[PDB]
């Protein structure tokens, strides 16, 4: 697919169609403030190409939206490079929402989950976020319909322990929570249980192949997951590799080069060399 920058879609639903040719959102995604929408506008709407989000995901006051299983059916990794107040996923006041349905969300690399004041929302206790997040203590899933203990959560699905109950884990009524073998770590596995390549992250189409990863554990280059961007490439947005030509076009209306990375600004103590975009140590204080 294609890689698109951060989005902030609100009010109209026509702005939402900007994700039709998008697989990786290099930034955040905020869908919010849609008061006149109905569930009739979401039954036929789908964005199956979206796979990964670099920053966070925000859903707030999107009326009519009852589930996300049809909106983002292939969302797998939320890297959380930049968080929304230490949250990589915020589901706040999402009325009419019946379930999450992100049956492909396998790993949130950074941040926590905030799901608050979402009425009519069930299928929450049937989610083991510890298999998705490393810091589940910082989660905050309260004030939902699942808090009333009377949700119609019905799931073959794997069963784990959250507090002191052996409950089966499933996203919807027909989608379990995919749990890979312990040996696969976070690399992901196939339906049969074969671990993906050690450079994958979440899921893959063929095991033991870094070119078949759905997402990259470190960096993406030439259609293959790599551990580091080798020379003469540069680490951009801490997820993919780019050449000097790419980092140069972004500067001409203001990114720079530092520590083999294409960053927006030189750090404190370095100034940009106007010739080769390379940050150099300043002479005394820098302006």
């Amino acid at each position, epitope marked *: 697919g294609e890689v698109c920058p951060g989005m902030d879609i609100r009010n109209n639903l026509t702005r939402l169609h900007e994700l039709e040719n998008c697989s990786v959102i290099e930034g955040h995604l905020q869908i919010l403030l849609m008061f006149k929408t109905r569930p009739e506008d979401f039954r036929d709407l789908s964005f199956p190409k979206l796979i990964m989000i670099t920053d966070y995901l925000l859903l707030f006051r999107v009326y009519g939206l009852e589930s996300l299983k049809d909106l983002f059916p292939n969302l797998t990794v939320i890297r959380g490079s930049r968080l929304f107040f230490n949250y990589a996923l915020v589901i706040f006041e999402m009325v009419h929402l019946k379930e999450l349905g992100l049956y492909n969300l396998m790993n949130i690399t950074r941040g926590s989950v905030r799901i608050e004041k979402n009425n009519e929302l069930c299928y929450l206790a049937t989610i083991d976020w510890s298999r998705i997040l490393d810091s589940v203590e910082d989660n905050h899933i309260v004030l939902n319909k699942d808090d009333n203990e009377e949700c119609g959560d019905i799931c073959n699905c794997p069963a784990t322990v959250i507090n002191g109950q052996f409950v089966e884990r499933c996203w919807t009524h027909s989608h379990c929570q995919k749990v890979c073998p312990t040996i696969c770590k976070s690399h992901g596995c196939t339906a049969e249980g074969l671990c993906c390549h050690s450079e994958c992250l979440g899921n893959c189409s063929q095991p033991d192949d870094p070119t078949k990863c759905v997402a990259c554990r470190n960096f993406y*280059l030439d*259609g*293959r997951c790599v*551990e*580091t*961007c*080798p020379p003469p490439y540069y680490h951009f947005q801490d997820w993919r590799c780019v050449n000097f030509s790419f980092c140069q076009d972004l500067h001409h209306k203001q990114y720079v080069i530092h520590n083999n990375k294409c960053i927006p600004e030189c750090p404190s103590g370095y100034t940009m060399n106007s010739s080769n975009l390379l940050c150099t140590p300043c002479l005394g204080p820098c302006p």
Partner: antibody
Amino acid sequence: QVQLKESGPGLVAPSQSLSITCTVSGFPLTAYGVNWVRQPPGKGLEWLGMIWGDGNTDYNSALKSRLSISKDNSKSQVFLKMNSLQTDDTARYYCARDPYGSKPMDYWGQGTSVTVSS
Amino acid sequence: DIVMSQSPSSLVVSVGEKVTMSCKSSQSLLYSSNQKNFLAWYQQKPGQSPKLLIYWASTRESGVPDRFTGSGSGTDFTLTISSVKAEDLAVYYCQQYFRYRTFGGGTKLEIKS
């Protein structure tokens, strides 16, 4: 099933050209680089050049003028052409895959022997 | 233009002995972004193609015995064989892959008999 095979002429007259084809299988050439390394009889390995996945090519600083590396991704083939051969160019020419982001040259072909004489 | 150099050229040794070979680089191979050295060691047994033993200065390739240990950082690197077996009769090359690739002269490891 990663495999790489060389196919050279074996005998080239001096001051002619050498054309070798590396037929790869088991990995996409779009994501892996392929090096060219020769080895004179009884001497050490010598890196000639490599071609990246996007198509960019790097060459030996001493032999950049004579070397030429191209590839065809649909055919899974990498080509090597050398100009103005000499008697000291007699060597076995290998081609090796290069997962440049992770590991160096891992899978090497059996190489092809090329003798430059009259 | 990076230049490698190995030492010694050749060395004879008996079975079950310790062997250490060096590999000096003209330029530091340490990558600042991941703190790893772009150096690999290669073993070429007689009648065979080169085999990747150790990459990233110290990381062993899948299927390499633990007798081969790679040490060093920056410009001075060494390869150590704990207990030399009879099957280790080969020529060992070191290759840098930071910018371009350069092979060393290689150390010929011969086994006494």
